[PDB]
Amino acid sequence: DLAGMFLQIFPRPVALALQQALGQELARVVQGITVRVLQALATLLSSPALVMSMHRSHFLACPLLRQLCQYQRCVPQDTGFSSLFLKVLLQMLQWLDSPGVEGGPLRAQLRMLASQASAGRRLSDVRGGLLRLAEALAFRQDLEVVSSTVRAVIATLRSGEQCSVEPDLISKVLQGLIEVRSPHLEELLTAFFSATADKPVVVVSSLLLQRLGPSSGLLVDWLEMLDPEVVSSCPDLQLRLLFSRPSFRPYLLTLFTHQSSWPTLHQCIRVLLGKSREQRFDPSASLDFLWACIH
Amino acid sequence: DVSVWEENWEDDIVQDDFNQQLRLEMFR
Amino acid sequence: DANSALMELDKGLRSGKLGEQCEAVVRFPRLFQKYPFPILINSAFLKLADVFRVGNNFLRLCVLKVTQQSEKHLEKILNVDEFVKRIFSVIHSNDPVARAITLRMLGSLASIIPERKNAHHSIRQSLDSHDNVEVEAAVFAAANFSAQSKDFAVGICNKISEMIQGLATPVDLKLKLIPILQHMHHDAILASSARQLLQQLVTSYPSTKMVIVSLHTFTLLAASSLVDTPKQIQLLLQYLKNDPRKAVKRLAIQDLKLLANKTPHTWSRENIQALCECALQTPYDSLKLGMLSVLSTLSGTIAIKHYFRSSDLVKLAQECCYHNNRGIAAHGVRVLTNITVSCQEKDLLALEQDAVFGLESLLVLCSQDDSPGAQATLKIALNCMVKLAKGRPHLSQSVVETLLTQLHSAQDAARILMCHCLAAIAMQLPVLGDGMLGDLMELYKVIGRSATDKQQELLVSLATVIFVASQKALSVESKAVIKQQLESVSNGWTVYRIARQAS
Amino acid sequence: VDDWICEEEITGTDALLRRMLLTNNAKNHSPKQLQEAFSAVPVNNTQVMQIIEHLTLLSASELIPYAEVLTSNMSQLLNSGVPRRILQTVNKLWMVLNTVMPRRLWVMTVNALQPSIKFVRQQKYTQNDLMIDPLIVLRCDQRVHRCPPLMDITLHMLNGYLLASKAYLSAHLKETEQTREELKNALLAAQDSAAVQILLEICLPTEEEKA
Amino acid sequence: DPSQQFLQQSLERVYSLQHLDPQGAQELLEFTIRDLQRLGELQSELAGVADFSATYLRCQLLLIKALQEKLWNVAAPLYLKQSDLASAAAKQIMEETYKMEFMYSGVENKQVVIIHHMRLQAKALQLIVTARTTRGLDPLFGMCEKFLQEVDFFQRYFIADLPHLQDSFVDKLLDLMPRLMTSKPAEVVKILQTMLRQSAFLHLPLPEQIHKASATIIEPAGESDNPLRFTSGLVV
Amino acid sequence: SPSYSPTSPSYSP
């Protein structure tokens, strides 16, 4: 039978035969009883234990879950089967949540599979995910929740269209993301600067003008990418970036010297020399810039 | 690079003159 | 002869039409290979330097190609001063391409005439020139001379620092200018000053290209100057965890792999713990694959012994051993195999069977698709099988049993590789002959109609493992083997190799 | 020598960046993707900038499929407001392509810089038309006379075709002859001096520059 | 100076990991030897102490390589010299201990007792292998009594340094020196070989200032031909 | 010669 084997092995040759069978039927799938075994295990586990029985024998169980996930990845068309596997993963997470069991390969594997499955699906709308992420980052907790919602946001953006932008929201969201130092920050920036444009350079410039240790290079690369003449868009922001009273200032200065049109530099030097009240621009940066422009 | 059987006689794909000549003279 | 050939080449040189001159000049290195006689080499290079001095820039370019190809024969130059003196004269030409070819010439000759101070001065003056080709040639020559001269390296490090920190220097020139610093491994204070400069570079120029170039050349410099290796390792780990860019993380992985390949013993427990934390934390499977490759490289060496029961490395390797991706699983189970075969603590006894069933899963995963990546992962797993059966011989019965149960269903290439693995295991312990011999024999029957390409090699490997399994005489079995050969092989080379293994 | 000396190694920094920056499936930046990015009527200089800035990492061989899209679109780069970064990068890519497919590149770059008076503006110059008369290179658009990267492209092509004409007339003279030497030398000298004179007249400030 | 710190940390790295598998121990040994040679190449000030410690580490590496050879598993009649590495290892470590003692300047008594101890280990290994190659009892008695006299001369010379050689090979020899002369020579070979295998690896305290002596012939200079012409028998 | 400035250091063979 099927349920008998799981109530036998978890609390050995039968496991080898079962795993070989799953491998052969997956070979049949890729060339062109997994549903039955998944239904049998779901019925066994919903019914009254077994999860802690196989917790000490994760070496026999974890490859089976990998095989089932490979089946799901091979063919996503068979919904219901995939959904039942997702429910089984949630049930495994919920039942195993007793903290006394300590860490394990099975626990982390189920967590990885659940995170992947949540990543696979798409969210309904960009705005709802953005508001959820802003709230989650504002609460300064639940890093896995923050990871899940940025995954949903990236999924909807890479499978979406021109939605509302709400610049102050995006500035605060990205400030929170760099503060918590997300791993999906570059992916998110790529996702929502590829489209959904209505002033990305203003967002990047405002973020940089605001401390920003590791992610400053990413933003610097970004406004080098989308602001070629550097001070072309919103000139006052870039003027106070390049000349004011920072770390990446020499890099941006080099870009502005060797990358901008001659009218741009002419207007810049007229600005630097036409301020009759300011003392706002740095003397050092302005003088080095003038010397660089001459030479 | 990586090898399963460290001491394997079939590893050498391009062989010495004796085995090359014997191979060509028998691979038919 | 030697003289005859040299005379012919000189005749081609004087020809005055550019085609024959270029033909002769590029014909020179073949002459050097023909007759490596130092009198001929010296006279020939003197003629080459003379045509270099007076002759258009394309001829000089051909001469530069010759000097780059004939770098070894430069050691056999006696009249070095005259040769360089007439090469060096064209640095005063107002033509920047001629100056560029001259700077590249001096760069090619940095091995034989370092510490020629006028040449150093020409590199230094040409560095801040206006023509772009002259500046690049000066950069290349500076790289060569810094690799050769300590005096030049210490003299030029300050110029390079003020050139990067200079603002008229564009970004691409800065990028070409940074990796001169990998040649500052002549001195301890020199290396320390260069390290300080590189730190200033990454903080003040945080672009992806420039941080990549700077932190990669800093890695090479710390690799050569061994004193800075631990702080380089901790800088790379810090950048791997902190810097969000995938290109920066990929570089951190690749050059940490370089460091772990050359000085694994200098890796500390803190570094391995930090790398394991990074691997557990990352969501990107390519990054996880890369730093797990680094972990497997470390675990192959003594660094695991320095690392030491349960820890983040063990949790990592158990977690990643059953990964969906095949490469992460292969590397994680290699890490498990190395830890298992290294130590003999009492907690490891639970770890070995985890490793064994991980290898089992890798066999079930990688034995069907026949992709080249599948072949790579299968080779990794099978080499691990061989390793932990040789190193932990009490665990070989289960290894061979899963190999037998899987040999029926695997594809032909996987069958070849598993037969090689099984042959190694059987050669290393003799107590399993008749049984497994019968199973491989009943497998041998169905080999006559497998495929057309891998059938021969599969037959060779299967007969080989049959012979290793056997330790006695067989008559009806030999009849079956011979009948199979006559029926399906009809080649002989397979029969000859099988007979070789039988002998 | 300039088309050859650029092949020379400075450090190998570009080898390192090609190794590191090219793996994350960035080859999806197809030539037709670049063409779509160019032909978009809001221009979207960010997109084309991104595409070509990825293209610099490609070796000269694999840049060849991108040759037509970035030559034929280069007349669009003459328009005002095109950032210097794109012009310099297109110059670098053209200089790279000049090392592998120079004759085809020059022929199809001359056609890309015609003034666009007509509907096609005679997009039919070939190697032979430019070899008999290299001054067609200076018959290009008015606007490249103040577009220094495109001016550099034009000067490279002009120098190349001056030398090509020098060789071509010798080849044709040998073929026809089966005096003329003086006529050939005078033609080459007058052609070169006319090229120099046209270049000097480009250097002059036009009355618009007087303002 | 981080160069000095790297030197000291490399030495304590190899000292602290003496418990490794002989394969891993050999890997650590040659890694440290390569590191110390490169360090001597880098900085000229520490070239002397780098060369000193590198030579001592090479001695230990050769001893470890010799002791783990497949020459002790087989019996005496099956001994072969063509595959022998232990005699070459013994000669090499013997010469290296001489070089270490005399070439380098700035040697105090602690360095000398460490070098003499390693020399004694070398002599013991040579005695073991020469017992392996021979069967007559006169050579065994001869070199065994000479070696025990050498041990006595050592322990007499270094009475003050004995309380610092803790867990050392000589400390194990001193536990059995009055009684070893009673036992049969084959058992003496067995006991000294066994207790040589598990003997500790001795820390080598560095001097404050030390250099390797060096000589540079300049006047002959080996330039080229045009040999020295002189008449036969007479002097040039 | 066109390739050398008049004030350049002269080359003595």
Contact C238, C215 (CB under 8 A): no
- Point out the residue among C420, C493, C497 whose CB comes nearest to the CB of B4: C420
| Closest approach of A213 to chain C, Cα-based (Å) | 9
A241, A208 in Cβ contact below 8 A? yes
With an 8 Å Cβ cutoff, is C306 touching chain E?
yes
Contact C93 F4 (CB under 8 A): yes
Identify the closest residue of chain F to C53 by CA–CA distance.
Answer: F11
Could you write out the DSSP letters of every residue in C16-62?
-SHHHHHHHHHHHHHHHHH---HHHHHHHHHHHHHHHHSS-HHHHHH
Q: How far apart are CA C215 and CA C175, in angstroms?
A: 12
**Chains in contact with B via at least 3 Cβ–Cβ pairs below 8 Å:** C
Please answer yes or no on whether B9 and C501 come within 8 Å at the CB atom: yes
Q: Give the C-alpha separation, E57 to E12, whole Å.
A: 12
- Chain F positions touching C51 (Cβ under 8 A) are none
Whats the size of chain A, residue-wise?
A: 295
Which residue of C204, C248, C364 is in closest CB contact with A19?
C364
Cβ separation of C457 and B10 shorter than 8 Å? yes
Under DSSP, is residue C93 helix (H, G, I), strand (E, B) or coil?
strand
Nearest chain A CA: its distance from C5 CA (Å): 52
| Cross-chain CB nearest to C216 (options D5, D10, D16) | D16
DSSP character string of chain A: --HHHHHHH---HHHHHHHHHHHHHHHHHHH--HHHHHHHHHHHHH---HHHHHHTTHHHHHHHHHHHHHHHHH----TTHHHHHHHHHHHHHHHTT-GGG---HHHHHHHHHHHHHHHHSPPS-HHHHHHHHHHHHHTT--HHHHHHHHHHHHHHHHT-------HHHHHHHHHHHHHHT-TTHHHHHHHHHSS----HHHHHHHHHH---TTTHHHHHHHHHHH-TTSSSSSHHHHHHHHS----SHHHHHHHHHHHS-HHHHHHHHHHHHH-SS---S-HHHHHHHHHHHH-
Interface check for C150 against chain E (CB to CB < 8 A): the answer is no
Query: Exposure of A5 by Cβ count < 10 A (0-12 exposed, 13-18 middle, 19+ buried)?
Result: middle
The alpha-carbon gap from D20 to the nearest alpha carbon of chain C, in Å, equals 6
Please indicate whether, in this complex, the C-beta atoms of A66 and C174 are within 8 angstroms of each other: no
**C213·D17 Cβ contact <8 A:** yes
Compute the residue count for chain C: 503
Q: Which of A23, A217, A255 sits opposite C208 (nearest CB)?
A: A217
Q: Do chains F and E touch (3 or more CB pairs under 8 A)?
A: no
Q: What is the DSSP string of C414-480?
A: HHHHHHHHHHHHHHH--TTHHHHHHHHHHHHGGGGGS-SSTHHHHHHHHHHHHHHH--S--SHHHHH
Q: How far apart are CA D90 and CA D66, in angstroms?
A: 11
Separation CA C333–CA C320 (nearest Å): 8
Strand partners, F4: C93
The verdict on a CB contact (< 8 Å) between F3 and C95 is yes
> Is C263 an interface residue toward E (CB < 8 Å)?
yes
Q: Is A215 on the interface with C (CB under 8 A)?
A: yes
Q: How far is residue A278's CA from residue A150's CA, in Å, rounded to a whole number?
A: 43
Chains C and D lie in contact, requiring 3 or more CB pairs less than 8 Å apart: yes
Q: Could you tell me if B6 lies within 8 Å of chain C, comparing CB atoms?
A: yes
Interface residue E1 vs chain C (CB under 8 A) = yes
Chain B residues whose CB is inside 8 A of the C491 CB are 26-27
State the best of C210, C216, C253 to mutate against chain D, taking most chain D CBs within 10 Å. C216
- Who contacts C473 (Cβ-Cβ below 8 Å, separation ≥6)? none
In C, which residues are within 8 Å of A20 by CB distance?
A: 364, 405-406, 409
Contact call for B27 and C386, based on CB within 8 A: no
Mutate to test the interface with E, among C76, C196, C305 (most CBs of E within 10 A): C305
Q: What amino acid occupies position E216?
A: T
Spell out which residues of chain D touch residue C99, defining contact as CB-CB under 8 Å: none
Q: Chains E vs D: touching, with 3+ CB pairs under 8 Å?
A: no
Alpha carbon separation from E69 to C391, C399, E63, E130 (Å, rounded): 18, 30, 10, 15
Q: Which residues of E29-65 are buried (b: 16+ CB within 10 A; e: fewer)?
A: bebbbebbbebbebbeebbbbbbbbbbbbbbbbbbbb
Q: Distance between CA atoms of C151 and C186, rounded to whole angstroms?
A: 9
Q: Are C108 and C88 in contact (CB under 8 A)?
A: no
Residue E43 in contact with residue E3, Cβ under 8 Å? Answer: yes
> How many residues are there in chain B?
28
Q: CB pairs under 8 A, 24+ apart, for E63-68?
A: E63/E89, E63/E93, E63/E118, E63/E121, E63/E122, E63/E125, E64/E22, E64/E25, E64/E26, E64/E29, E65/E26, E65/E89, E66/E90, E66/E125, E67/E22, E67/E125, E67/E196, E67/E197, E68/E22, E68/E26
Judging contacts by C-beta atoms under 8 Å, the chain A residues touching residue D86 are 228
Q: Which residues of D touch A261 (CB under 8 A)?
A: 83-84
Nearest residue in chain C measured CA to CA from A151: C283
Say if residue E24 is exposed, middle or buried (CB neighbours under 10 Å; 0-12, 13-18, 19+): middle
Select from C331, C375, C383, C417 the residue whose CB has the most chain B CBs within 10 Å, as the one to mutate to test that interface: C383
Q: Hey, what are D199's tokens?
A: 């270049």
Q: Write the DSSP assignment of D132-190 as a string of letters.
A: H-GGGGGGS-GGGGG-HHHHHHHHHHHHHHHHHHHHHHHHHHHHHH--HHHHHHHHHHH
Closest CA to A146 of A133, A131, A156: A133
CB C91 within 8 A of CB C103: yes
Kindly determine whether residue D85 and residue A228, on different chains, have CB atoms separated by under 8 Å. Answer: yes
Q: How far is CA C450 from CA A41, A199, A256, C446, C490, in A?
A: 36, 63, 67, 7, 15
Which amino acid is it at E215?
A
C-alpha–C-alpha distance, residues E135 and E138, integer Å: 9
C500 touches chain B (CB under 8 A): yes
Residue-wise DSSP of C375-413: HHHHHHHHHHHHHHHHHSGGGHHHHHHHHHHHHTTS-HH
Q: Which chains are within 8 Å of D by 3+ CB pairs? A: A, C
End-to-end CA distance of chain D: 40
Chain C residues close to F11, C-beta within 8 Å = 53, 86, 89
B25 inside 8 A of chain C by CB: no
Residue closest to C56 by CA, chosen among A62, E216, D139, F3? F3
Give the span between the Cα atoms of A135 and C211, in whole angstroms: 34
Chain D residues with CB under 8 Å of A225 CB are: 46, 49-50, 53
- A16 at the C interface (CB within 8 A)? yes
Burial letters for A109-123: b for 16+ Cβ neighbours within 10 Å, e otherwise? bbbbbbbbbbeeeeb
Closest chain A CA to residue D147: A261
Distance CA C413, CA C417 (A): 6
Contact status of A76 with chain D (Cβ, < 8 Å): no
Q: Which of residues 209-248 of A touch D (CB under 8 A)?
A: 225-226, 228-229, 232
This entry's atomic model was obtained through cryo-EM
